[PDB]
Design a protein around this motif. Structure first.
Motif, PDB file in Angstrom:
ATOM      1  N   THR A  99       3.677   4.414   3.201  1.00 47.56           N
ATOM      2  CA  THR A  99       4.274   3.780   4.380  1.00 47.56           C
ATOM      3  C   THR A  99       4.445   2.233   3.865  1.00 47.56           C
ATOM      4  OG1 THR A  99       3.286   4.969   6.177  1.00 47.56           O
ATOM      5  CG2 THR A  99       3.522   2.595   6.593  1.00 47.56           C
ATOM      6  N   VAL A 100       5.413   1.416   4.643  1.00 49.84           N
ATOM      7  CA  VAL A 100       5.569   0.165   4.334  1.00 49.84           C
ATOM      8  C   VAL A 100       4.945  -0.713   5.677  1.00 49.84           C
ATOM      9  CG1 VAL A 100       7.342  -1.849   3.819  1.00 49.84           C
ATOM     10  CG2 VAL A 100       7.585   0.602   2.613  1.00 49.84           C
ATOM     11  N   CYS A 101       4.108  -1.545   5.361  1.00 52.73           N
ATOM     12  CA  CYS A 101       3.519  -2.233   6.369  1.00 52.73           C
ATOM     13  C   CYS A 101       4.414  -3.388   6.701  1.00 52.73           C
ATOM     14  CB  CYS A 101       2.274  -2.624   6.378  1.00 52.73           C
ATOM     15  SG  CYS A 101       0.861  -1.429   5.934  1.00 52.73           S
ATOM     16  N   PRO A 102       5.150  -3.253   7.889  1.00 53.15           N
ATOM     17  CA  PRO A 102       5.994  -4.444   8.378  1.00 53.15           C
ATOM     18  C   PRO A 102       5.438  -5.878   8.411  1.00 53.15           C
ATOM     19  CG  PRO A 102       5.314  -3.406  10.341  1.00 53.15           C
ATOM     20  CD  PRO A 102       4.943  -2.596   9.162  1.00 53.15           C
ATOM     21  N   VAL A 103       6.269  -7.021   8.510  1.00 48.50           N
ATOM     22  CA  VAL A 103       5.456  -8.449   8.760  1.00 48.50           C
ATOM     23  C   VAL A 103       4.794  -8.176   9.832  1.00 48.50           C
ATOM     24  CG1 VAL A 103       7.859  -9.455   7.573  1.00 48.50           C
ATOM     25  CG2 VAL A 103       7.870  -9.066  10.199  1.00 48.50           C
ATOM     26  N   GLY A 104       3.818  -9.094   9.904  1.00 50.48           N
ATOM     27  CA  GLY A 104       2.927  -9.117  11.137  1.00 50.48           C
ATOM     28  C   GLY A 104       1.763  -7.811  11.080  1.00 50.48           C
ATOM     29  N   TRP A 105       1.888  -6.972  10.062  1.00 45.95           N
ATOM     30  CA  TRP A 105       0.932  -5.812   9.637  1.00 45.95           C
ATOM     31  C   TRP A 105       0.548  -6.070   7.991  1.00 45.95           C
ATOM     32  CZ3 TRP A 105       0.044  -1.350  12.921  1.00 45.95           C
ATOM     33  CH2 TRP A 105       0.382  -1.318  14.365  1.00 45.95           C
ATOM     34  N   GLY A 106      -0.620  -5.351   7.971  1.00 48.00           N
ATOM     35  CA  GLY A 106      -1.147  -5.305   6.470  1.00 48.00           C
ATOM     36  C   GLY A 106      -1.689  -3.970   6.253  1.00 48.00           C
ATOM     37  N   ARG A 108      -4.620  -1.793   5.664  1.00 50.44           N
ATOM     38  CA  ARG A 108      -6.144  -1.716   6.101  1.00 50.44           C
ATOM     39  C   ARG A 108      -6.670  -0.634   4.973  1.00 50.44           C
ATOM     40  NH1 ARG A 108      -9.332   2.025   7.649  1.00 50.44           N
ATOM     41  NH2 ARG A 108      -7.692   3.371   8.287  1.00 50.44           N
ATOM     42  N   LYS A 109      -5.967   0.496   4.562  1.00 47.98           N
ATOM     43  CA  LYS A 109      -6.674   1.356   3.640  1.00 47.98           C
ATOM     44  C   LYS A 109      -5.556   1.763   2.653  1.00 47.98           C
ATOM     45  CE  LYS A 109      -8.565   5.990   3.062  1.00 47.98           C
ATOM     46  NZ  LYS A 109      -7.593   6.188   1.961  1.00 47.98           N
ATOM     47  N   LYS A 110      -5.657   1.414   1.342  1.00 42.07           N
ATOM     48  CA  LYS A 110      -4.871   1.589   0.169  1.00 42.07           C
ATOM     49  C   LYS A 110      -4.445   2.989  -0.017  1.00 42.07           C
ATOM     50  CE  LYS A 110      -4.662   0.835  -4.682  1.00 42.07           C
ATOM     51  NZ  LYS A 110      -5.102   0.149  -6.128  1.00 42.07           N
ATOM     52  N   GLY A 111      -2.982   3.039  -0.205  1.00 39.34           N
ATOM     53  CA  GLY A 111      -2.524   4.387  -0.180  1.00 39.34           C
ATOM     54  C   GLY A 111      -2.873   4.901  -1.810  1.00 39.34           C
ATOM     55  N   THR A 112      -2.958   6.435  -1.567  1.00 37.53           N
ATOM     56  CA  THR A 112      -3.545   7.107  -2.963  1.00 37.53           C
ATOM     57  C   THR A 112      -2.411   8.172  -3.258  1.00 37.53           C
ATOM     58  OG1 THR A 112      -4.629   8.736  -1.752  1.00 37.53           O
ATOM     59  CG2 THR A 112      -5.916   6.844  -2.171  1.00 37.53           C
ATOM     60  N   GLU A 113      -2.728   9.013  -4.105  1.00 37.23           N
ATOM     61  CA  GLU A 113      -1.710   9.967  -4.301  1.00 37.23           C
ATOM     62  C   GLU A 113      -1.816  11.113  -3.428  1.00 37.23           C
ATOM     63  OE1 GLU A 113      -3.392  12.474  -8.090  1.00 37.23           O
ATOM     64  OE2 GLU A 113      -4.122  10.347  -8.479  1.00 37.23           O
ATOM     65  N   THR A 114      -2.940  11.180  -2.718  1.00 42.47           N
ATOM     66  CA  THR A 114      -2.887  12.036  -1.636  1.00 42.47           C
ATOM     67  C   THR A 114      -2.934  11.845  -0.156  1.00 42.47           C
ATOM     68  OG1 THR A 114      -5.538  11.903  -1.852  1.00 42.47           O
ATOM     69  CG2 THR A 114      -4.302  13.820  -3.163  1.00 42.47           C
ATOM     70  N   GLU A 115      -3.316  10.405  -0.129  1.00 38.30           N
ATOM     71  CA  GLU A 115      -3.371   9.864   1.386  1.00 38.30           C
ATOM     72  C   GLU A 115      -2.367   8.628   1.339  1.00 38.30           C
ATOM     73  OE1 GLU A 115      -6.760   9.623   3.715  1.00 38.30           O
ATOM     74  OE2 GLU A 115      -8.094  10.332   1.913  1.00 38.30           O
ATOM     75  N   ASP A 116      -2.011   8.701   2.459  1.00 38.77           N
ATOM     76  CA  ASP A 116      -0.600   7.604   2.799  1.00 38.77           C
ATOM     77  C   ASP A 116      -1.265   6.142   3.262  1.00 38.77           C
ATOM     78  OD1 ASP A 116       1.678   6.087   3.316  1.00 38.77           O
ATOM     79  OD2 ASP A 116       2.020   7.086   5.287  1.00 38.77           O
ATOM     80  N   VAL A 117      -0.797   5.214   2.885  1.00 37.74           N
ATOM     81  CA  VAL A 117      -1.292   3.732   3.280  1.00 37.74           C
ATOM     82  C   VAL A 117      -1.400   3.854   4.751  1.00 37.74           C
ATOM     83  CG1 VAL A 117      -0.683   1.364   3.637  1.00 37.74           C
ATOM     84  CG2 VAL A 117       0.123   2.453   1.595  1.00 37.74           C
ATOM     85  N   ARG A 118      -2.638   3.079   5.338  1.00 43.09           N
ATOM     86  CA  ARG A 118      -2.846   2.782   6.506  1.00 43.09           C
ATOM     87  C   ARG A 118      -2.741   1.320   6.785  1.00 43.09           C
ATOM     88  NH1 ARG A 118      -4.839   8.045   4.704  1.00 43.09           N
ATOM     89  NH2 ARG A 118      -3.756   9.152   6.096  1.00 43.09           N
ATOM     90  N   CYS A 119      -1.968   1.077   7.643  1.00 40.86           N
ATOM     91  CA  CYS A 119      -1.633  -0.111   8.305  1.00 40.86           C
ATOM     92  C   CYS A 119      -2.232  -0.526   9.380  1.00 40.86           C
ATOM     93  CB  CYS A 119      -0.153  -0.054   8.453  1.00 40.86           C
ATOM     94  SG  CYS A 119       1.077   0.242   7.035  1.00 40.86           S
ATOM     95  N   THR A 126      -4.986 -14.461  10.746  1.00 43.54           N
ATOM     96  CA  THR A 126      -4.471 -13.608   9.495  1.00 43.54           C
ATOM     97  C   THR A 126      -2.886 -13.502   9.617  1.00 43.54           C
ATOM     98  OG1 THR A 126      -4.950 -11.538   9.570  1.00 43.54           O
ATOM     99  CG2 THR A 126      -6.639 -12.807   8.854  1.00 43.54           C
ATOM    100  N   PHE A 127      -2.195 -13.343   8.598  1.00 47.61           N
ATOM    101  CA  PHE A 127      -0.810 -13.212   8.919  1.00 47.61           C
ATOM    102  C   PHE A 127      -0.255 -12.282   7.589  1.00 47.61           C
ATOM    103  CE2 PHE A 127      -0.819 -16.673   5.937  1.00 47.61           C
ATOM    104  CZ  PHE A 127       0.164 -16.536   5.107  1.00 47.61           C
ATOM    105  N   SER A 128       0.975 -11.803   7.989  1.00 43.84           N
ATOM    106  CA  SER A 128       1.688 -11.052   6.789  1.00 43.84           C
ATOM    107  C   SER A 128       3.089 -11.436   6.900  1.00 43.84           C
ATOM    108  CB  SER A 128       1.310  -9.534   6.644  1.00 43.84           C
ATOM    109  OG  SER A 128       1.846  -9.104   5.484  1.00 43.84           O
ATOM    110  N   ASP A 129       3.682 -11.909   5.851  1.00 45.80           N
ATOM    111  CA  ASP A 129       5.049 -12.288   5.984  1.00 45.80           C
ATOM    112  C   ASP A 129       5.840 -11.517   5.446  1.00 45.80           C
ATOM    113  OD1 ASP A 129       4.319 -13.092   3.529  1.00 45.80           O
ATOM    114  OD2 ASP A 129       5.328 -15.181   3.506  1.00 45.80           O
ATOM    115  N   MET A 135       0.181  -5.095   0.041  1.00 47.19           N
ATOM    116  CA  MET A 135      -0.481  -6.345   0.559  1.00 47.19           C
ATOM    117  C   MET A 135      -1.153  -6.118   2.061  1.00 47.19           C
ATOM    118  SD  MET A 135       2.511  -8.987  -0.460  1.00 47.19           S
ATOM    119  CE  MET A 135       1.829 -10.502   0.289  1.00 47.19           C
ATOM    120  N   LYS A 136      -2.407  -7.060   2.012  1.00 46.88           N
ATOM    121  CA  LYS A 136      -3.493  -6.892   3.140  1.00 46.88           C
ATOM    122  C   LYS A 136      -2.842  -8.525   3.861  1.00 46.88           C
ATOM    123  CE  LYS A 136      -7.540  -5.475   0.651  1.00 46.88           C
ATOM    124  NZ  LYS A 136      -8.715  -5.836   0.454  1.00 46.88           N
TER     125      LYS A 136
END
Length: 163
Positions: A99-106, A108-119, A126-129, A135-136
């Motif tokens: 999953t690609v976390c959009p701007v305004g999100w970051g 939360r849990k790093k993606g792995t080879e078995t589990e998707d990213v958690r945004c 804090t901010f994500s541009d 990125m967090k």
């Protein structure tokens, strides 16, 4: 040091204690009452994970199904191991981009080879541009700590402007 295994000698029927062969090899010749057992390296495509007394190495599993790749090769001591490539995770019998976390999100849990990213939505302060699957959210530039004032508040997408 290395272990041993029992072998019935063909010609005499004698039950012998022979030396096991190290992982990565197999017994190409069992010992006899007057000779040491001989070990040989596993041929390409085969392996043995431990000290053994076997006469043939195990065949490695089949090549990885694309897009999966090898994280471990088929080598004398290891069967190949497959995995979704970096940036992807195992999903419904196959691989899917994280999953690609959009701007305004970051992240939360790093993606792995078995589990998707958690945004997660960026917490206040804090901010994500940028859109991103790695990125967090980042903390605002601390204006006060720079003897400056916040001339423009930040948002979950942008840093505050100090001045």
């Amino acid at each position: 040091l290395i272990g041993t295994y029992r072998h019935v000698d063909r010609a005499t029927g004698q039950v012998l204690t022979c030396d096991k062969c190290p992982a990565g090899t197999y017994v190409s010749e069992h010992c006899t009452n007057t000779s040491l057992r001989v070990c040989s390296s596993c041929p390409v495509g085969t392996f043995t994970r431990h000290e053994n007394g076997i006469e043939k190495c195990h065949d490695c599993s089949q090549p990885c199904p694309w897009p999966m790749i090898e994280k471990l090769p088929c080598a004398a001591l290891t069967d190949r191991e497959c995995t979704c490539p970096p940036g992807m995770f195992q999903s419904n019998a196959t691989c899917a981009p994280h999953t690609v976390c959009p701007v305004g999100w970051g992240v939360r849990k790093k993606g792995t080879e078995t589990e998707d990213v958690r945004c997660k939505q960026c917490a206040r302060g804090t901010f994500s541009d940028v859109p991103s699957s790695v990125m967090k959210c980042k903390a605002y530039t601390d204006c006060l700590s720079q003897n400056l004032v916040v001339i423009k508040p930040g948002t979950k997408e942008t840093d505050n402007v100090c001045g």
